[PDB]
Amino acid sequence: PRFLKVKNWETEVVLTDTLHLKSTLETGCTEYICMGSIMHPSATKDQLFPLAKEFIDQYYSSIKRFGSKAHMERLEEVNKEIDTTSTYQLKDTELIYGAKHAWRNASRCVGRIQWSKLQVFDARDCTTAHGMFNYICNHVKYATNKGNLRSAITIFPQRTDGKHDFRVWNSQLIRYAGYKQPDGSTLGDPANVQFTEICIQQGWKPPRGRFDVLPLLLQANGNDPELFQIPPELVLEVPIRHPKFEWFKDLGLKWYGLPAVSNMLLEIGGLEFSACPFSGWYMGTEIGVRDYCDNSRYNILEEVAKKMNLDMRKTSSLWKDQALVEINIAVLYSFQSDKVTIVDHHSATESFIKHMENEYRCRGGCPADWVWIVPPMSGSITPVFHQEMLNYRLTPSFEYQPDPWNTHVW
Amino acid sequence: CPRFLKVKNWETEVVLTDTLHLKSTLETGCTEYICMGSIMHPDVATKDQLFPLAKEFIDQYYSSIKRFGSKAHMERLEEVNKEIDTTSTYQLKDTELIYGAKHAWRNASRCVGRIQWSKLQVFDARDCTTAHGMFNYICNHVKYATNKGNLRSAITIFPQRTDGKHDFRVWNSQLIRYAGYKQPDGSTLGDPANVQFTEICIQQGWKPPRGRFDVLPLLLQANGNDPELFQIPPELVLEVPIRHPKFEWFKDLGLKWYGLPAVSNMLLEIGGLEFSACPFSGWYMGTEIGVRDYCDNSRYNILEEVAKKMNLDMRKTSSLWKDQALVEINIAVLYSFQSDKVTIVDHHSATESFIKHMENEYRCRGGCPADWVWIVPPMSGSITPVFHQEMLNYRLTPSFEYQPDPWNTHVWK
Numbered sequence: 069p070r071f072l073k074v075k076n077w078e079t080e081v082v083l084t085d086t087l088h089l090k091s092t093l094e095t096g097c098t099e100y101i102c103m104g105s106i107m108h109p110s111a112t113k114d115q116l117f118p119l120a121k122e123f124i125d126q127y128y129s130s131i132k133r134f135g136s137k138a139h140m141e142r143l144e145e146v147n148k149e150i151d152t153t154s155t156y157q158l159k160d161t162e163l164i165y166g167a168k169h170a171w172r173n174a175s176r177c178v179g180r181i182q183w184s185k186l187q188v189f190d191a192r193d194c195t196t197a198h199g200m201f202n203y204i205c206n207h208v209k210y211a212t213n214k215g216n217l218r219s220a221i222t223i224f225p226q227r228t229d230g231k232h233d234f235r236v237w238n239s240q241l242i243r244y245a246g247y248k249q250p251d252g253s254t255l256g257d258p259a260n261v262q263f264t265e266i267c268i269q270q271g272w273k274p275p276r277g278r279f280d281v282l283p284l285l286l287q288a289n290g291n292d293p294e295l296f297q298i299p300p301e302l303v304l305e306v307p308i309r310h311p312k313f314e315w316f317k318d319l320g321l322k323w324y325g326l327p328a329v330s331n332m333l334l335e336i337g338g339l340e341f342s343a344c345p346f347s348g349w350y351m352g353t354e355i356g357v358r359d360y361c362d363n364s365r366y367n368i369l370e371e372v373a374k375k376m377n378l379d380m381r382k383t384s385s386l387w388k389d390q391a392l393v394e395i396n397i398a399v400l401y402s403f404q405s406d407k408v409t410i411v412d413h414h415s416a417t418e419s420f421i422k423h424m425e426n427e428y429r430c431r432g433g434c435p436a437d438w439v440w441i442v443p444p445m446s447g448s449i450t451p452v453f454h455q456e457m458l459n460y461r462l463t464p465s466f467e468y469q470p471d472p473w474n475t476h477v478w
Numbered sequence: 479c480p481r482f483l484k485v486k487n488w489e490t491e492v493v494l495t496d497t498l499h500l501k502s503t504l505e506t507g508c509t510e511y512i513c514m515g516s517i518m519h520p521d522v523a524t525k526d527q528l529f530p531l532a533k534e535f536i537d538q539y540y541s542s543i544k545r546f547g548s549k550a551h552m553e554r555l556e557e558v559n560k561e562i563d564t565t566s567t568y569q570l571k572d573t574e575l576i577y578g579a580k581h582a583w584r585n586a587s588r589c590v591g592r593i594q595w596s597k598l599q600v601f602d603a604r605d606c607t608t609a610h611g612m613f614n615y616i617c618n619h620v621k622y623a624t625n626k627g628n629l630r631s632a633i634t635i636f637p638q639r640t641d642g643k644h645d646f647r648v649w650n651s652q653l654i655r656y657a658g659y660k661q662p663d664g665s666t667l668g669d670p671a672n673v674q675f676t677e678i679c680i681q682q683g684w685k686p687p688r689g690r691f692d693v694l695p696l697l698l699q700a701n702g703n704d705p706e707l708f709q710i711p712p713e714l715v716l717e718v719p720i721r722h723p724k725f726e727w728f729k730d731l732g733l734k735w736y737g738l739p740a741v742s743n744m745l746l747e748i749g750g751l752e753f754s755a756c757p758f759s760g761w762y763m764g765t766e767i768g769v770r771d772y773c774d775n776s777r778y779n780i781l782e783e784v785a786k787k788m789n790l791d792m793r794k795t796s797s798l799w800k801d802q803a804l805v806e807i808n809i810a811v812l813y814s815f816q817s818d819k820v821t822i823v824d825h826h827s828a829t830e831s832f833i834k835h836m837e838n839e840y841r842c843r844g845g846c847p848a849d850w851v852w853i854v855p856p857m858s859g860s861i862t863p864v865f866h867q868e869m870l871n872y873r874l875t876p877s878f879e880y881q882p883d884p885w886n887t888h889v890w891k
């Protein structure tokens with residue numbers, strides 16, 4: 069149960085971790101087996117109050133009021149409410165503190181230097197899918213801000229008995245449709261083919277193009293989900309072009325400005341918010357390496373290398389690698405030219421090392437998942453590659469949850 | 479622990495089941511509440527300690543040759559037991575030594591090249607007694623492994639540790655490496671990673687040429703005596719000058735690298751026995767030279783100079799001038815080796831072979847320990863098939879282990 073050191077082998081800087089001692093949730097590893105590359109490893113009144121007490125305790129600790137009259141009174145209030153209702157409600161201040169800290173605690177996010185600038189929208193009074201649609205339209209408009217993107221989260225009512233869950237069925241608020249072709253191939257985004265069929269089956273008339281914006285599929289109070297169209301003037305998009313290669317715009321690529329993840333679960337003090345879409349801005353490689361060049365995604369490396377007239381017969385010509393750099397140059401140039409906020413992996417990994425040093429200084433550690441933090445291209449020439457990291461699970465947190473079409477009954 | 483563990487590939491959705499993890503021996507550094515997978519590294523054995531370790535190994539060996547529980551198995555068990563009982567150690571048979579060495583490689587979770595494990599040439603040097611003899615064994619290893627550019631994997635194994643005061647060591651970190659010299663003005667000539675060992679060699683009497691690519695001498699310790707200096711015959715050191723298929727000016731940078739990667743500071747552990755000197759070698763993956771040796775800030779650090787000759791905009795990072803230069807460098811390295819007919823493999827081919835190897839191991843062995851943090855290549859990660867592969871890491875014996883630098887522990891005579 070020591071203090072653990074972490075070393076940077078580029079700078080020989082050595083930080084000391086004490087924060088991991090405060091961890092409670094399990095990571096998935098054992099003393100004999102490490103599972104750090106597994107993507108997803110492995111209530112009632114009775115267990116609810118201790119989880120509530122822990123969270124209330126660290127909140128009043130954070131505002132230098134630990135043991136105050138207010139603190140004592142809030143604990144008493146919460147006990148009486150779990151007693152008589154089998155749950156409790158967060159104060160507005162607590163809700164904001166809780167959401168900011170779930171971002172702060174997200175081991176896999178390289179963008180956490182921004183964690184305390186998070187705009188929190190409280191949607192806990194929502195009762196229908198129409199009201200969900202309204203709240204989501206306001207979120208998108210605020211976060212987009214005509215290209216000057218601002219970080220935000222919208223929080224719908226918490227889970228009760230499990231039969232009345234609020235869910236956003238989309239995995240992101242803005243995504244493109246994908247279509248299984250008669251000839252076996254895929255049109256549009258292949259990552260979204262299943263969701264697209266669910267939408268068509270629900271009455272959505274598909275334009276059947278490469279970049280059709282999906283409709284929102286929204287579930288309130290455990291009812292059947294309902295389809296809504298996002299007003300097109302709210303969806304900001306960027307035509308992808310290349311600063312040197314004139315032919316690149318002829319490829320006809322484009323992407324949306326706003327990354328907004330909508331299928332995770334937010335956990336604060338034992339309460340579960342099953343619908344809580346949150347958004348920031350992109351790191352270029354999320355679009356240019358993964359979205360465009362994954363074999364199971366848009367997979368455009370082949371066409372681009374052809375236009376570059378590269379030798380594609382042998383792998384050792386690194387034609388895949390040259391074409392990759394060029395696509396990511398194009399993505400960054402396009403966003404920047406249209407004044408839409410974006411960060412490159414060099415600048416982002418720099419910021420994160422600075423953030424780590426901040427957190428060790430003021431908090432005594434920073435949980436970090438090397439497997440996800442290091443970018444999907446040019447790893448070792450970014451500073452995070454050579455940085456030792458410790459990974460552990462703090463709460464409040466964001467968690468994975470099951471796709472609602474596996475659980476729902478109509 | 480559960481009997482079955484599942485890993486998924488997120489690109490192909492293929493799912494594999496691991497049972498081999500039940501045979502795991504030592505700790506990893508992780509716990510239920512913390513993971514240390516990105517940490518680089520997370521007085522002899524007694525009789526009572528050594529008995530069960532030898533038995534475990536002997537059982538493993540006779541099981542592998544399909545003679546488990548045989549008369550010969552039970553006699554070997556008895557022979558080893560008496561030997562430990564009356565000498566506090568024992569000696570491996572030649573067959574057992576060869577099996578152990580091959581399986582230390584097979585068990586190396588950080589090696590992407592393990593599809594080759596069963597083809598290792600093993601050189602028994604347990605009769606060695608002096609540093610001159612160590613030099614002779616090491617020269618023969620280098621000549622055999624190099625094979626005029628058609629490289630062949632090999633290990634040479636010197637006598638095991640006894641009381642700890644008589645260790646055999648190769649003080650070099652690799653058999654072939656270039657010198658580094660710290661200048662009075664703070665700059666470095668040669669390879670910065672080797673400044674310390676170079677200073678030690680100079681102190682022991684080496685007269686340095688003081689250039690950019692000077693092959694270091696061997697510093698060899700036998701039977702616990704003070705180490706001795708030997709120059710490797712230059713004709714045994716195969717090198718490759720680096721050029722580019724398209725940029726004529728790339729040859730003007732004056733770069734070269736050596737053909738044979740041969741790690742010499744690790745310890746080999748078999749059945750509880752410790753071989754502190756065990757140099758082993760294979761051939762290079764391009765990125766090892768092209769990305770790390772050349773482009774690490776604390777190494778030769780040539781990105782800026784290449785970027786200038788490519789005439790890239792270097793004032794903004796978001797122009798990805800670094801990423802562009804890195805690719806061309808790695809292109810030139812692969813091109814030069816192939817042109818000179820020296821064995822080398824690109825990271826695409828290597829990772830693809832490793833996925834095939836890993837699936838075959840899951841099927842015939844019930845698993846394959848692997849360290850994602852080291853297996854995934856230092857450039858273009860997500861467009862290689864290992865990026866999307868879930869892996870399990872655990873430690874099997876026989877194994878290769880880290881050990882302290884010898885100058886920190888050695889008692890000078």
Ligand code: HEM
Pocket residue numbers: 171174176177178179180182186219220221346347348349350351354411416440466
């Ligand atoms: C502000 C700019 C941000 C940037 C540049 C950024 C960057 C990233 C990247 C690149 C990833 C890995 C994504 C992937 O490879 O799939 C990630 C993960 C993640 N982000 Fe951030 N992010 C930002 C903001 C936020 C915000 C505002 C939140 C929440 C309020 C957040 C929560 C998370 C979580 C929970 C993960 C891990 C998801 C998982 O475990 O699957 N991020 N981030």
Ligand code: HEM
Pocket residue numbers: 583586588589590591592594598631632633758759760761762763766823828852878
């Ligand atoms: C035959 C071609 C081989 C290739 C292409 C290969 C490839 C690699 C690479 C790229 C690494 C990571 C290097 C680094 O980043 O420092 C590595 C690590 C390693 N290899 Fe291999 N290897 C080969 C042969 C061998 C052989 C013959 C042995 C032993 C008999 C071996 C044992 C190891 C060990 C023990 C490590 C990890 C060392 C550590 O933990 O620091 N390899 N290999």
Ligand SMILES: CN[C@H](C)Cc1cc(C#N)cc(OCc2ccc3c(C)cc(N)nc3c2)c1
Pocket residue numbers: 327328329331332346347348349350351354468469
């Ligand atoms: C195929 N690989 C899958 C998509 C991995 C993944 C799964 C889930 C979920 N559920 C959620 C994920 O979210 C990543 C994420 C989350 C939030 C982000 C924000 C707020 C900004 C940003 N630039 N990227 C993000 C990236 C990722």
Ligand SMILES: CN[C@H](C)Cc1cc(C#N)cc(OCc2ccc3c(C)cc(N)nc3c2)c1
Pocket residue numbers: 739740741743744758759760761762763766880881
């Ligand atoms: C700065 N990072 C350091 C050098 C990591 C490292 C340490 C040690 C040791 N001791 C040994 C190491 O060996 C890596 C290795 C070992 C064997 C190899 C073989 C046999 C072939 C090959 N192509 N690469 C290897 C690479 C690496």
Ligand SMILES: C[C@H](O)[C@H](O)[C@H]1CNc2nc(N)[nH]c(=O)c2N1
Pocket residue numbers: 077453454455456457515516517518851852853
């Ligand atoms: C901090 C991190 O664990 C360290 O830099 C590792 C990462 N992965 C690596 N992977 C390989 N193949 N070789 C290395 O030297 C390293 N260094």
Ligand SMILES: C[C@H](O)[C@H](O)[C@H]1CNc2nc(N)[nH]c(=O)c2N1
Pocket residue numbers: 104105106107439440441488865866867868869
């Ligand atoms: C198997 C492996 O864990 C999986 O492919 C991970 C690897 N690292 C990643 N890192 C990021 N940032 N995003 C990812 O989706 C993944 N995928």
Ligand SMILES: [Zn+2]
Pocket residue numbers: 097101102103104508512513514515
């Ligand atoms: Zn682990």
